[PDB]
Each structure stands twice: as structure tokens, then as C-alpha cells.
Amino acid sequence: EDAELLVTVRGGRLRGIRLKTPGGPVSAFLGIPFAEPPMGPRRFLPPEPKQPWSGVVDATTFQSVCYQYVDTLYPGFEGTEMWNPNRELSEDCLYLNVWTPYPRPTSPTPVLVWIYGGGFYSGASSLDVYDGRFLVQAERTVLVSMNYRVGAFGFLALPGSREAPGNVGLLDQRLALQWVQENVAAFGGDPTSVTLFGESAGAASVGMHLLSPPSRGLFHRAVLQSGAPNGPWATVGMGEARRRATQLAHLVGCPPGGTGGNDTELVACLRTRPAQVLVNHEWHVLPQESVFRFSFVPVVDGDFLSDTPEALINAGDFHGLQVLVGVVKDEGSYFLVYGAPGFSKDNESLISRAEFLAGVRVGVPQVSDLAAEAVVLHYTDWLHPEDPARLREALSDVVGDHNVVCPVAQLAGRLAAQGARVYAYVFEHRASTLSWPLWMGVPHGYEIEFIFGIPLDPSRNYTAEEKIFAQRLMRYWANFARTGDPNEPRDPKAPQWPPYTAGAQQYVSLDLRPLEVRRGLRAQACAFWNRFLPKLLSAT
Amino acid sequence: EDAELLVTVRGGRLRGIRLKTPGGPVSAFLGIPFAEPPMGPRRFLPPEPKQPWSGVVDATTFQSVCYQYVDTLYPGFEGTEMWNPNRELSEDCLYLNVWTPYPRPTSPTPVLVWIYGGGFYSGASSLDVYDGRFLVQAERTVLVSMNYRVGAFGFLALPGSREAPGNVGLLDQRLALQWVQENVAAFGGDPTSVTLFGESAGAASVGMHLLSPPSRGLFHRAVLQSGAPNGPWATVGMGEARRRATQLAHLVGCPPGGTGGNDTELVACLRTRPAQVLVNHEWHVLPQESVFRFSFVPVVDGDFLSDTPEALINAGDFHGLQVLVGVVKDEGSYFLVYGAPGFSKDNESLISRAEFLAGVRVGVPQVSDLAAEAVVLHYTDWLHPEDPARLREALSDVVGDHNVVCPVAQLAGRLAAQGARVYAYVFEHRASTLSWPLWMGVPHGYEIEFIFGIPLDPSRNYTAEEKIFAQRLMRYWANFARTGDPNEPRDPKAPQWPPYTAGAQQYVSLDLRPLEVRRGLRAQACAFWNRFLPKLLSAT
């Protein structure tokens, strides 16, 4: 009863809240502090563990969202507002949430840990689409989700220095994983069966924890949804990260005119600026106009990432690891209304040939003109080279394959061929309540609502098929969290999900229809990005 | 009767022979001299018109074949020896043949002029597969075919000199066209309706006469079968042509060590060598190991070709011209047994991945390593990158597209978009009597026997459907020769053959089935060869 809403952890006591679902109640503990507030002199520093507290911390509501840019491209539009912060912004944001079934599991239960995306510049665990009450009720697992510092507060890096080493947002996630190992048993969760799953930048974060030894021991399975650490947007070099941090300091008047600009005096000036001031100049440090590019992302520093993600993936041994990867059908369509010429969510975006050629330079930023010609060659239907509809779908494939599909396929192939058991999927169901235009198809990020069982919410207008389809996906994710295999171990009737291998390259399609096995995650398109295009740049 | 076998031309009197067909007799005049024998001091010189003769020249049999290399790759094999000379070799070979229907047409009849192929190093108008008795009988047209000098005797060029200017083999064809304008009326032919049609190097020759003003006035229609003048094999630069001519001279002891080596002394030494000696060292002149490359080809000298064929095609007005172009289904499979590793006509040629990678360098001779990577990328099925059968068909596509299909498609597109009406086809029928292995499919050059109605020969074992198929093809070629349109001028029952345009790119498939309209002569593959690869070669 109400006694299950009281839980004692290593830091102190907590009071949770009961959440209602159409199938039964769920105990939730929202806003658990796992770190000291990274404010004042702690800005840009790695997180410190939350010191124990006296009394009962109220864990009945979500805590504050980390300071981040708020999207204003389409004010009042559900498709964009659903990702904006739904709580007040604050640097005091290092809090996590725990959903546990009712009654509380008496036996150790596998744990799912969600890491939200948002290009490492935005996101929050309090968003309605991340509501874990339906996944926990239907599958009786323990779900944990944490907040981590985004933007400059989480990834501004002056490499080599000590006042701003970078990757502190990744250390926020690692500390939350250490908190799960020390306290998830109090909620009925098994710390020996922890499955990380995230989307976009969260998926890239899950991949970077696979490549970091201090983080690898905190979990046992990984699910990467529409993201990978080896993408062209997930990491930056030490020289570029220093240029962006110095440019942001210049934009906010750091250092004051006539003062030396070493790393100590530069970060000290940054720590005196209000948090909103740094956010208002975050986008003004990118090197060129582009889409799917972000200012402050994880940096290859030799510490958290001893080498580039590509180098660590190639030289890595992943025996004893189960991975679930996948993408949506239209990964790049969402990002085209953020810079590609001739695109608009309120029309058909029937772009011309000239707009397609210009959009390639925005979708593939800062590459040689010869490299851009190779992209146009592969993504042009030369039997209909001027068809606006085909060009619109072509540029969507350019951005999606370059940033998501091919980095994921590259990762999935190296993982399976080096010990790991990999399962791959392609999400091909467009939600009936999707507010984005029809030409975007199945946009990036809109499989999350089905993984979290949002169609089960009675206050929403999802169809009856989508409710059954959502329960299938929650079954897939939970079975992978329990056994490392998305297939139901009791049911040979259901169509089987074959593992992904570097040779067969088998994957399944996720939609209202039963499972369908296909081969190749755009093998022809991803051979251009992963094999030839690097050689075309090496010769310049 | 026998009176129609007697014909007087401008040079003198001729006696022909009556040829029998299952549908009626045909009057033939084989071995008509149209030029002085290019022997002795006339070697390497342009042809001179045949001086008038006394008495009756016997024109009842084919004359001598020009000196040329004889294929010895598969001795005793029908597939190769059907192209070898069937008459004695001699430099006295400039003779032409005329087939005219019986009874002789009283009205002017459209004239077809055949130019044989053979990589500009071999070929003869006396070959059995060029027998024009069936095309002339079934369609009541006048057919002319000539011999032209091949190899060094026709295309050895010391550019600038007067002793060996090059392209004299093309001038032999031009002189034969001037002979048709002056004498084809005596056989019942119309000198105002002359249609050139050729194959491989013959098709390239037909294209070069389109781009040469002195030759363009001698004909009115053109048919290019599996060849184009803009191919990477049909022409050679002035510097490379001088190196090959000097290397051939060195191989035969010219100049005698150690005397001067100016162009006059070099050609004088070459004219003293027996003709067979020059032939025996022809293949030891090419720069690298390759297939679909030939030693002595037309040279871009500024005379016969004022510029490169590519430049003349782009900056040319073709209004009032009707062109019929096309290719066979498997253009490159025949050339793979002539140098590609792992290939053999007597096995399945299931090559490995390494043999495919090495074969690309032979099929695409002397390109940058980066260019070879681009070819490997485009022609590799990255879902089955090691499948021997797919690699065999891939290398066949590499050679066929690079040398035939894409040069033809580039030509057909420029002709259609600049005034000329173009009809395109793809020959997809494999002859039931074909001696080449099954994996070659429809090899290069094996549509000729159907164009000339060879299945109508009662001494051969063609099927009943192939006889009907050959008759329908002869009607297509004759209708184009008569009216400029391969379609039936009045029959609406049979499906129509739409023209080829640079936008729609419509073509028809020629096989036992009725006409089927398709779009794009391998538009995706040929965009790589015609658009992207030249830019990759510019930026080395």
C-alpha cells in the first residue's frame, strides 16, 4: 500500500507517488538527487556524489531541467514543443527517477535505464513521451532515467585543462549508473541485469559507455535507437572543442578587454556569467551553416574516450554482450526544416534541383566540392533528375544515412563480427496522431512513444491497433532486457527475430504487420559513406 | 535473267553472280575495285580512286582480306573463327560489294551501307555473317559493303607528316561512299537515300563520318550497333599515336641502327618491311595489359576530326538526321576471356573477390587507384560482395558500360537533344546456335546474324521463331532506311517504337517477345562514367 511509497537508499529516505495506468498502479520515485548541484565553482566540473541527507526527500514530482536551448522554430506546434523543457530551467538538475511495479517485486528484477537524446544540447527525463508507467506496468521491470548536463554546461571543453575538462555530461550519466548499482536493489531491481537504452544523442551516449572501461562495468546490455557514437555529429576534436569554447567566451565578453586568456582565467570568467547568457550564444559557435550539427558534444580527449569512437569500435572485443540497434524509416526528414533551402513543414517541400544541390552542402557540411558531387551522384535518380518529390526524399536520405543509418550499420556490423550478439530493426509505423506533415513519413524520434506504451494513455487518441502494437514493442524491449533476446522464449508461433550478422545483415521491420525479415541496412548507400567517401577525402 | 548480271559503272564493266535464297534469287557484284591497290609507296597513304579498266572485271566472288591479326585464342572454335579472314590476306584489298534485288529495281531504292567492326585491327566484308542476300531479298533494298585497311596499314599515324597522316582506313570508307554516290544508281539504288549501319568499330566509324563534314554529305541516315566514336577505345591522341608508331618501327628494326629517325626515314623503313612482319608485332605496342583496347585506331589530328569526338558531339547541330542506336544485353562478357584473370570460356568463370579487383584494372586500364575504388564501389553488391556469380556479371557490366553502353547512351542523348531523331534498342535474344558459354548471355556482336537474316539460311539449325524474329528485325532496319522510322508506316497492330529523347530515354527490347518499351540505358551506371568519373580524374 502506501508503505511501498517509502524507500531508504544510501543517501537517506524517499517518498514516492503512485501512478495510475489502465492495467494497474505503479510506484514512482521522481526527482532523486544523485549528485551535488553543479553550480558556482562546480560549473564545467565532473559531478560529485550527493552527500547523505536528513529526513525524507519528496520524490513525488520531476525536478528541474538542465539549462538548455528552447526550440522556437514553430511556436505552439506539438511536434516541437513535446521536446522542450516541461519544468523550470536550473543548473541544479542532477536528479534521476525510478519506476517500480506494484506490488514491489520481491525477486530481483532486470532494470532498464533510459538516456534521453537531444543532440547533447537539450532534453529532459521529465518529458511526457518518456513516461515509464506503461512499460513498468505491462512488463513488470524497473525503469530508471536520469538528467545530465547538456550544452556548454555538460560538454564545453578546454582539452588538457582542469577547470573545464569536458565530457562532464557523460560523467553525470556514469554517476547515475553507479547510483543504480548501489541503490536499485531497494526498489526491487537487479543490479546484475542493467540494460541501457537511449535515442539519438542518448543512443550515442549508450555507445560511448560501451567504449569506456569505467562505464562498461555498470551495465550488461545496450539498446541504441537512431544513434551511434561513431557518427559525424557525436564527437569533436580537441582543437575544434577549444575553438568553440573560446568563441563562446568571446561572445559573452570573456576575457574582459585587456586580460590574459589562459584556460584558468577563461573558465573563471565563464563561471561568473548567468546560465541563460551562455545558452543565448550557443548556436553562434558552429563553423558553418548546417543541419544535424551541434556545438558542444563529447570530445575525443584520451580520458573518457581513450581514442576516437571509430578506433575503439574496430579494436574492441564485445564477447558476452547483447546489443539491440535500429533506426526509423525516415531519419533525415525532421532535420530538413532546420536549414535546408525550400523546406517547410506547412507545405509539400517540393524542392527544385538547385535547392537540392544547395541542401547537400547543408546536410553534408564542410566537405570538398568533389565530395559533394559524389553525394549528388549516388542520391540522384538520373531518369528523373528534376522531380521535386524524388529530390525531397533524396535529401532526406542524404541526411539520414550520413548521420544515423550508416553510422548505426557500421557499428552493428563491427559488433556482431567481434563477439557481440546484435539484433537490428527498422521502425516503419507512422503514428496516427503525428502532427508533422505527411511527407516526413516516419520522422526521427517518433518510435519512442510506442516503446514507452504512450498509446495506452486513455487521454490520447491512438487507435486500437497501435495499442496492441505498442504492447508488442514493450514485450520486445523487456525480453531483451531480461534474456538478451527480443524473441519470446515461450512462443515459437510468433515470427522469429533473427540476430544481425556482418554477413547476412538480417533485420526486422516494426509496424502493425507481423515481423518481416529483410537483409541490409541500406548496404549500397552505406558503402558510399563508410568505405568510399573517406578515401575520397584522404586524396582530397 | 543473265542480262541483269552485267553492269557498267564509271570505271568499266562488271559481271555479277546470282545468289539463291529460299524466297528468290539476288544479284550480287562481289569484289568491285574502288581504289588503286595501296601497295609499295602507297602504304600508309590516303586511297586514290581506281583508274578505269578495259574489258569485264569479274565480280562473282569476294576479293582479298586486308592484312590483319588472326585470332588464335581458341583454335577450331566457331565463336572466334567466324570473325577470322575467310580469304587470303593482301594489301590489295580495297574492294566493295553490291547486293541488288532480282528483278533489278526500276525505281530508285534506298541503299544500306555496311561497315564491319573488329576494333580497327581486323574484319572483312566477306564474312559469312555479313551475307546480304537475305536482307536484300526480303526487303528489296540495295546493300553495299566495303573493305577498309585495318591495323597499322589503316591507322598508323605519325601526326603532321605526309608519309603517314593516319585515319587512311576511314578515308577508304569515305572513298567507298563517294563510289556509292557515283555508281549505286546503275544497280537500282538511290544515292539520295543512303543509310550507314555498322557494329563495334564499324559503329564508331559511322559516328566519325557524322562528325566529319566531307563525309556527312555522302549519307543521310546512321545506325550504330554496339559502338560509338566517343568511346575510350575508338580514338587516340597525337602523342600516343606517335609513340605506338615509333614502337612498332623499333620492333621491326626501324630505323636501322644507327641512322636518322625523322618521320620520312621512319615510314620509308616501314614500307620496306613485309606486311606480315608488321602484323606480328601489332599487339606488342599497347601501353598496359588490358581488354577492349587496340593499337592503331583513328587519331585526333585536326584533319578528319577537327576536334575530339566528344567535343564535336556536344557542339554539333544534327537537325534533319535520323539515328538508330542500340546495344546487346551483355556487351562486356565476350572481352573478359581476353585478359581478365580467372575467366575461361570452357568453365563457369566463377571468379573470386581478388580476381574481380584485379580484373577492374584490366577492364579499366591505367586509371588512378582512387578511380578503381569508385568503380569497385559502384559495381559491388555489398550484400553479397564475395558471390562469384555476381562478381562475374559485375565485371562484365564494368567492361560493357565503360566501352559500349555509356558511350552510346551519351551519344544518343546529345543527338536527340540537338535536332536528330533517335531510336534506341537493346538486343536481348541469345541465339539457339550460339557456341559461346551460357554465362556470356547475349555477347557483343551476336545481333548481326539476325539483322542480316542468317537464320533464313536453310543449311543452318535456327529455330522457327528465330526466322520470324530475324524477318521482323530486317523490317525494322529497312523501314528506318526507307523512311527514317523503324515503325511500320501504316500497320497499327504491332506495338510502336517511340523515339529516344534526352528526357524520357525510351528504348525497346528486341527478342522473341513483342516490342516492350523501357526507360534509361543504364542511367545510374552511366552517370558514374559520363558525369562523376571525369571529375574524379581531373582532381587526380
Ligand SMILES: O=C(/C=N/O)NCCN1CCCCCC1
Ligand atoms: O536550431 C537551431 C537554432 N539556431 O539558433 N539551428 C539549427 C540547428 N538544427 C536544429 C537542432 C537539431 C536539428 C538539426 C540542427
Ligand SMILES: O=C(/C=N/O)NCCN1CCCCCC1
Ligand atoms: O587478342 C589478343 C592478342 N594479344 O597478342 N589480346 C587480348 C586483347 N583483346 C584483343 C581483341 C579482343 C578482345 C579485346 C582485347
